[PDB]
Symmetry: C2
Subunit: 346 residues, 2 copies
């Protein structure tokens, strides 16, 4: 029998638990605290999400088996752990209330260690550290036999989560040559947004600009692939940018124009990735209609925009933090993270 | 018999005459001074160039008939007045030493009043002011019967030339709506350069930038259609831009990269007009080779560049002067001038 976990209740549970963790003083309240610290501070991202998700599920509905990863697992209390983790923890909680400190993963239950019916030592794992963390996370979840124990361990896990750092790139290096390669690289999917965001930082860093990127497929988005970048000055957005690596559609335009017009933002740029070039819209019509709503709309290919901003741009004691924060805020994929890591060592 | 006027001597003559005019105190030295003032201060651009050219020719080589406009005219002393005016006066003199005060025309001898073998009252002309100036310019040139008289009247003509103003557009108007239409208009030929120059002024005016455009087809240009824009800050060029409404070629690239690398300029943008989209070059190859010469090269369509700069840009007590100076410096065509004049009244 599967258990249908109430995600509204789960959200309130984890918010309470985070609040308890933020004021927690005694974290050694049970013998699993050592294992909890080692998993949460450890290097295996998927086991961190599996641990938080299973503890949250049991603290919300004690009928779940917290070792179940899928609702079709052959155990009583199987439940849709992917849905709980992606909808509640990733979708609503980690960004706003944990500063991306669990890892800022967008879809952690698509990683190989989560693609099993059960979280068990029968699942393959690399010798050494990973094998240790697999068994530790199993042991903690096996100990979460009651709702109150699950909640107690959830608060401990979030207490240590708050101690993690959310930096993925890390000496006065040759930031000139690396930044230019990222600017001018043939982008794909979300790497288009990262390059565009970096370009804007270069151009505006010295002009007081603050660039903020947002993860794709938010609630109420016009399409699933569009990615929002806001450019602030004096803490007011003056430019709203949308990045898409699929052709923009009329709903994308309508949503962005209406959203800017409401906010009093008068400039919107739509940036087209290499796979967004074949138009489904009449860009001229969109611009004309946008003007009637008092919004100045324009379109550019991403790589043209990035190289133009770079040409127009002027120290680099802030580029690393900016990239780290941007990768965190968009819940960047591993491919994107590996690309940025690789080009900083090359 | 045609007369072959020595343009090197003609250049030295007019430079001397300008210097005399700059220090001239008595301009009433002969009875033609009234007519000279009325032609030079008058509104008929082609008669101003015809007058200056004929006086210069006679002051250089008194064998010319200063009423001849073409070397095949049926008079002794016919000579190539178009060549003298375009090569020497327009090509070398008016910009640097007269501040464009004759009219900053690029090809004045292609205007209809100059397309005759002789400058004569038989040529058709509009009733009223134009008819008066035609006859006045004829009368002065008919009086230029000796080299010394031609030179005396040339100095008077340049004395009054220096009193002219070189402004072609002219209340706190709606500079917002007009500038945006010029930014976003479907450009053609040199109107692409004007829009691009305006975009850069908007983006950099408040950042200390000075934008300088140059006329097409300079001596030693890589091609006949390319148009140079330099962007200064602190009186150092930091960005060199080329605008072309025909496909760029490898000589264009080589010239711009070599010229920037020599000057120590590290950024070059090539802007493609709507008729420059079909490539004759591999842009990626050009960029890679430019990087090896320490120059960062990029390409953009003009209209993408202009709308992007506008989106990134922040008072308008300086836009009129900037446009007037830019139109002057490129020796803008009448079509370009009429377009800018029209959209400022519409």
């Amino acid at each position: 029998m599967k258990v249908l976990v109430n995600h509204e209740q789960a959200y309130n549970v984890i918010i309470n638990a985070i609040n308890d963790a933020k004021k927690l003083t005694d974290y050694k309240t049970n013998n699993q605290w050592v294992s909890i610290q080692n998993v949460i501070l450890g290097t295996h991202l998927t086991y961190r999400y599996i641990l938080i998700t299973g503890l949250l599920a049991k603290a919300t509905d004690p009928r779940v088996n917290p070792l179940a990863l899928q609702a079709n697992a052959p155990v009583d209390g199987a439940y849709d752990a992917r849905s709980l983790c992606h909808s509640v923890i990733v979708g609503k909680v980690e960004g706003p209330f944990l500063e991306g400190k669990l890892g800022a993963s967008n879809e952690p239950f698509l990683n190989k260690p989560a693609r099993y019916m059960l979280h068990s030592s029968d699942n393959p794992v690399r010798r050494g550290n990973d094998k240790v963390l697999q068994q530790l996370s199993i042991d903690i979840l096996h100990a979460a036999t009651t709702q109150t124990l699950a909640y107690e361990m959830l608060v401990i896990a979030l207490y240590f989560t708050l101690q993690r750092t959310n930096r993925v790139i890390t000496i006065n290096f040759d930031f000139h040559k690396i930044i230019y390669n990222i600017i001018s690289h043939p982008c794909d999917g979300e790497t288009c947004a990262i390059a565009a965001a970096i370009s804007l930082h270069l151009l505006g860093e010295q002009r007081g600009w603050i660039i903020k990127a947002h993860p794709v497929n938010q609630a109420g988005s016009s399409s699933k692939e569009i990615l929002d970048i806001d450019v602030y000055h004096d803490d007011i957005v003056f430019l709203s940018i949308e990045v898409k690596d699929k052709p923009f559609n009329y709903q994308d335009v309508n949503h962005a124009v209406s959203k800017a017009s409401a906010s009093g933002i008068s400039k919107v740029i739509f940036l087209k990735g290499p796979r967004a070039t074949n138009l489904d819209i009449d860009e001229s019509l969109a611009i004309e209609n946008a003007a009637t709503k008092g919004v100045s709309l324009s379109f550019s290919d991403v790589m043209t925009f990035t190289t133009t901003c770079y040409a127009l741009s002027p120290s680099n004691d802030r580029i690393i933090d900016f990239i780290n924060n941007t990768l965190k805020d968009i819940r960047a994929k591993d491919s994107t993270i590996e690309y940025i890591q690789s080009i900083f060592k090359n």
